[PDB]
Structure 1
């Protein structure tokens, strides 16, 4: 029963899991964010170029 209340009370006990999933998103996020990067060209969009 003490576990049932504990998991119902705290949210950090599952940190080791969220730390995984968050990263799976975060790296994906920056993997999309690099599309906005121009890398030195005159425009960062392909159809513009």
Structure 2
């Protein structure tokens, strides 16, 4: 089934691109880290006031 398997693989990769390029939430785990750090710094700066 090598040809079938290669075709399914190639298709699956194309699906990954379609998901990643259109679903912003797909990378929420990394964006959340950035957001937490940004909040920590914004909080720290605002405290100066």
Normalised by the size of structure 1, how large is the TM-score?
0.69
Q: Please report the RMSD computed on the Cα atoms of aligned residues, expressed in angstroms.
A: 0.5
Moved over 2 A (4+): none
| Structure with more contact order per residue of length (Cα contacts < 8 Å, sep ≥ 6) | 1
The equivalent position to 1:24 in structure 2, one of 10, 16, 37, is: 37
The equivalent position to 1:11 in structure 2, one of 21, 24, 40, is: 24
- Where in structure 2 are there 5+ consecutive unaligned residues? 1-13
Normalised by the size of structure 2, how large is the TM-score?
0.69
- Where in structure 1 are there 5+ consecutive unaligned residues? 37-49
How far 1:24 sits from its partner (Å)? 0.8
